[PDB]
């Protein structure tokens, strides 16, 4: 826009680039967001204006949805650093156990905020995870695709990360629960307690098969269903369940407890954000200051 001054690229999400920008007429610095063949996508356009009211501590503020000029901008405010960087960063050391776990329960708190307002994410990744000086972390560019969907890329070609994405979403579910965001968190948490992702599959399939090695192949007896979803086979392998204390040494038994909710095939029997939050394994969460390189 033209009462933006770019100052920088951050990052090429899908269907849209974000900039670092600064509002030439206020100068405050914000996140800004531009997206976009036609027919103009008034019923997404709704939805996403929606995510306005969306006020928390934990998630990042839309300060404003403008359409224009057959283009769409997205306006939040800025944060410094994300999750994917300090974790890259953090790589030699390891995060911290307490700063690990005061952003988990932080996130874990907005979304028990936004499920409790029927508000899902939908594409939570570490990229998505922001984190400022003050030892805050917040959900930033919730998805609601279940207005907008999603084709293949951004827009313009470019790989997209299936690392976190829920079992029933990969089985072609259809209709996501609030559980698809704890599966995704649960799996930032694996990677951030051992520094690697959990499940880094390259491929849809291939991110199911990591999914089933790991936590065996899924049947209706763990979840009642699974054999008559969409992309179920009877034809995919049956692998057992590893031991978990092998899946996030050395995270202790009440991490492994929480993790091992977060990880439940069935969704309905998935831990819910608001149930997380009272899992002993907050106990004596406190919220420490990370050191932050910007
Ligand atoms: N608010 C906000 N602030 C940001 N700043 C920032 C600063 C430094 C770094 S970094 N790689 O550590 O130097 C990364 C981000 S980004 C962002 C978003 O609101 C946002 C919007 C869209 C997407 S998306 N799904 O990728 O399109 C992701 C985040």
Redesign the pocket.
Do not use: P, W
């Given at each position: 826009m033209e009462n933006f001054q770019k100052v920088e690229k951050?990052?090429?999400?899908?269907?849209?680039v974000?900039y670092?920008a600064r509002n030439k007429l206020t100068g405050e610095v914000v996140?800004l967001?531009k997206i976009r063949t036609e027919g103009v996508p008034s019923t997404a356009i709704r939805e996403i204006s929606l995510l306005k009211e969306l006020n928390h501590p934990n998630i990042?503020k839309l300060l404003d949805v403008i359409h224009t000029e057959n283009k769409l901008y997205?306006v939040?405010?800025?944060?410094?650093?994300?999750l994917?960087?300090?974790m890259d960063a953090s790589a030699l050391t390891g995060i911290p156990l307490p700063l690990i776990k005061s952003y988990l329960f932080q996130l874990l708190q907005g979304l028990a905020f936004c499920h409790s307002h029927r508000v899902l994410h939908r594409?939570l990744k570490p990229?998505?995870l922001?984190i400022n000086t003050e030892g805050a972390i917040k959900l930033?560019?919730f998805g609601l695709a279940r207005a907008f969907g999603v084709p293949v890329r951004t827009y313009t070609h470019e790989v997209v990360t299936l690392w976190y994405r829920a079992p029933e979403i990969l089985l072609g579910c259809k209709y996501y629960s609030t559980a698809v965001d704890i599966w995704s968190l649960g799996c930032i948490f694996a990677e951030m307690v051992t520094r690697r992702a959990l499940f880094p599959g390259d491929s849809e399939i291939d991110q199911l098969f990591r999914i089933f090695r790991t936590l065996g192949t899924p049947d209706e007896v763990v979840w009642p269903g699974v054999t008559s979803m969409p992309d179920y086979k009877p034809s995919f392998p049956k692998w057992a369940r590893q031991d978990f204390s092998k899946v996030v040494p050395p995270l202790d038994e009440d991490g492994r407890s929480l993790l091992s909710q977060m990880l439940h095939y069935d969704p309905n029997k998935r831990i819910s954000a608001k149930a997380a939050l009272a899992h002993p394994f907050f106990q004596d969460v406190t919220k420490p200051v990370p050191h932050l390189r910007l």
């Open positions: 951050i990052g090429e999400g899908t269907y849209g974000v670092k996140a967001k990042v997205l939040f405010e800025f944060l410094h650093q994300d994917k960087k300090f594409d990229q998505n922001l930033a560019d």
